[PDB]
Every structure is written in C-alpha cells, then in structure tokens.
Amino acid sequence: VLKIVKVYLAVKRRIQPGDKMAGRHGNKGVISKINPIEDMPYDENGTPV
Amino acid sequence: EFLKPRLVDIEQVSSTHAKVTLEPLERGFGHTLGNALRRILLSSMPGCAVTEVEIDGVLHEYSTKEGVQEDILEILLNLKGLAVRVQGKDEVILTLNKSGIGPVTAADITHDGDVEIVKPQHVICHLTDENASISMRIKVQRGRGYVPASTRIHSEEDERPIGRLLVDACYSPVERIAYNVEAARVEQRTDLDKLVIEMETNGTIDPEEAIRRAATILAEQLEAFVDLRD
C-alpha cells in the first residue's frame, strides 16, 4: 500500500421517536413521539414538563 | 346573555414577563379562552431567529478558532438564543465585528435601524486573543414554530458555500405561558370572571400584539366551522 487517506465525517444525530433513551436505574425506554410543547402538561406556574 | 371580555391593564413584571388580563368574561369561558390562547401562543407565533451564521475564521461547525474559550459549536448554540426583533425586512444579515480580548456580547453586533436587540448583555463568546478578530455574518429571518436546519438543505441539495453554518431555527418568541381564572367582582351583571395570562417571552413581541395575533389565528381557524361549505 502506498498511501492511506482517512476521512472523518460528522453527523449531528438528533433525538427522535424510537431512540433508546434510558435512565441510570435500569429505567429504559423508546422515544414514543415528539409532541408539540403545548401538548405537554404544565404546572400551576405554567412550566411544561 | 353574553358580555365580551375586554382587555384591561397590561403590566410588565419585566422586559420578558407580562401579565395580560380579561376582566368581563362569563363563567365557563375562562378555561376555554386560557387554553386556546396558551396553545396558540406556544404554537403559532411569528418570530425572528437565526438560520445561517457566516464566521470568517472557521469553515465548519466542528472546527475551533484561535483565541476563543468557546467552540464554534457553542457559538451557534448561543446565537440560537439571540433575542432579536425585526420590523421592515423579513430577512436581515447582522454583522458582528470585534477584535481584542473580552466577552463579545450581543450588543457588540452592528445594529441597523430595522433591527433591535432586546437583549444587549447577551454573551456571544469570549475573545481571549489580544489581536484576533471575530467576524460573523448572522442571517436572522422571520418564521414560525421550529425548523431544524435539515429541511432547507434538501431544497437545494447541500449549501453551495462552505463557510455558512446552518442552525436549527426556533421562531418561538414565547417560552412560558400560564393562565389563571379567578372570581372577579364587578358592577357588570353578577356572574363574570377574570382571566390573567402570565407570559415569559424573549421580549421581541409586544404582549398586546401577541394576544391580538393569537385571537386572529383562532378566529381564522373558527371561520370554517362558522360557515360550513357543505
């Protein structure tokens, strides 16, 4: 072999419905779907969850 | 019968916090109006946001630049939060040019007459090199909702220039909304309640204009049900 050219490609992978996202305790899950922020619940102060 | 709610004093808790009140609203209509307005505000408001950033020094998102404590990645991430309003032009190209050490902030951007920076003390980066120069050409345009910078790339099959960096544009002036319905006492009849909407927004939209635009969208949507074509 004469030369070796290595190319690095960067992909900005965003979370989306389906990715395996899990907590520390063994809590697991699959992202169900990205519902709009307004559809998410909110507390008395109005902060969405 | 019916009495229309009427806009009353719009106080400013801060430049970003505003409470708008509708006093003469009948029982049973408070939660309906509050929910509708909250959904419209978090869904359908127009807003100015950054899409393309053209930094002279770097060529792509993942390449660092000399004399900055922040990667170009955090440059884009902080420029995402740039609180800016435009009036006449739907698309503008702000120019940031600053040399010397110090924290390069939002106020350092060359502000035009059509562009107002409601957040001047917003830190963009930190130029730690005594003789380096940061030069950004920031494209800020009007839009709605949230457009990830992965849809316009398919519209032209990859950006022809290389120095332009695409940022997922969040055209959401408002980030927090709450509404409270309280038993109001007024000489008008005997059964009305007041609806108070507390709003945390980036300060790029007038609260009165925000409420008016939300009501306009609600009315335009209800137009179809008011008159059924079939």
UniProtKB/Swiss-Prot annotation, chain A:
Technological use: Co-administration of salinamide and rifampicin or salinamide and myxopyronin suppresses the emergence of resistance to both antibiotics.
Annotated membrane-spanning segments are none
Q: Which domain of life is it from?
A: Bacteria
Could you describe the post-translational modifications of this protein?
A: Acetylated on several lysine residues in the presence of glucose.
Q: What's the stated role of this polypeptide?
A: DNA-dependent RNA polymerase (RNAP) catalyzes the transcription of DNA into RNA using the four ribonucleoside triphosphates as substrates. Resistance to the antibiotics salinamide A, salinamide B, rifampicin, streptolydigin, CBR703, myxopyronin, and lipiarmycin can result from mutations in this protein.
How does it associate, per the subunit comment? The RNAP catalytic core consists of 2 alpha, 1 beta, 1 beta' and 1 omega subunit. When a sigma factor is associated with the core the holoenzyme is formed, which can initiate transcription. The rRNA transcription and antitermination complex (rrnTAC) consists of RNAP, NusA, NusB, NusE (rpsJ), NusG, SubB, ribosomal protein S4, DNA and precursor rRNA; S4 is more flexible than other subunits. In pull-down experiments interacts with CedA.
> What family, per the record?
Belongs to the RNA polymerase beta chain family.
Name of the protein this chain belongs to:
DNA-directed RNA polymerase subunit beta
To which species is this protein native?
Escherichia coli (strain K12)
Instruction: Tell me the name of the encoding gene.
Output: rpoB
Q: Which residues of the full protein are shown?
A: 1046 to 1094 of 1342
Curated annotation (Swiss-Prot), chain B:
Q: Which cysteines are joined by disulfide bonds?
A: none
GO BP annotation list = bacterial-type flagellum assembly; bacterial-type flagellum-dependent cell motility; cell motility; cellular response to cell envelope stress; DNA-templated transcription initiation; intracellular iron ion homeostasis; nitrate assimilation; regulation of DNA-templated transcription elongation
What this protein catalyses is:
RNA(n) + a ribonucleoside 5'-triphosphate = RNA(n+1) + diphosphate
Highest taxon listed in the record's lineage? Bacteria
Keywords of this entry:
Acetylation, ADP-ribosylation, DNA-directed RNA polymerase, Nucleotidyltransferase, Transcription, Transferase
The UniProt annotation puts the region (Required for interaction with Crp at class II promoters) at 156-159
Which residues does UniProt call coiled coil? none
Positions of region (Alpha N-terminal domain (alpha-NTD)) = 1-229
Instruction: Report the EC code(s) recorded for this entry.
Output: 2.7.7.6
User: What GO cellular component entries does it have?
Assistant: cytoplasm; cytosol; cytosolic DNA-directed RNA polymerase complex; membrane; transcription elongation factor complex
Under which main EC class is this enzyme filed? transferase
The molecular function terms in GO held by this entry are: DNA binding; DNA-directed RNA polymerase activity; protein dimerization activity
User: What's noted about post-translational modification?
Assistant: (Microbial infection) ADP-ribosylated on both alpha subunits by the phage T4 protein ModA. ADP-ribosylated on only one of the alpha subunits by the phage T4 protein Alt.
Please describe what this protein does. DNA-dependent RNA polymerase (RNAP) catalyzes the transcription of DNA into RNA using the four ribonucleoside triphosphates as substrates. This subunit plays an important role in subunit assembly since its dimerization is the first step in the sequential assembly of subunits to form the holoenzyme. Part of the processive rRNA transcription and antitermination complex (rrnTAC). The complex forms an RNA-chaperone ring around the RNA exit tunnel of RNAP. It supports rapid transcription and antitermination of rRNA operons, cotranscriptional rRNA folding, and annealing of distal rRNA regions to allow correct ribosome biogenesis.
Describe the family membership recorded for this protein in Swiss-Prot or TrEMBL: Belongs to the RNA polymerase alpha chain family.
Self-association state and partner proteins as the record states: Homodimer. The RNAP catalytic core consists of 2 alpha, 1 beta, 1 beta' and 1 omega subunit. When a sigma factor is associated with the core the holoenzyme is formed, which can initiate transcription. Both the N- and C-terminus interact with different regions of transcriptional regulator CRP. The rRNA transcription and antitermination complex (rrnTAC) consists of RNAP, NusA, NusB, NusE (rpsJ), NusG, SubB, ribosomal protein S4, DNA and precursor rRNA; S4 is more flexible than other subunits.
UniProt remark on domains: The N-terminal domain is essential for RNAP assembly and basal transcription, whereas the C-terminal domain is involved in interaction with transcriptional regulators (such as CRP) and with upstream promoter elements.
What is this protein identified as?
Answer: DNA-directed RNA polymerase subunit alpha
Quote the gene name from the UniProt entry: rpoA
Q: Which residues of the full protein are shown?
A: 7 to 236 of 329
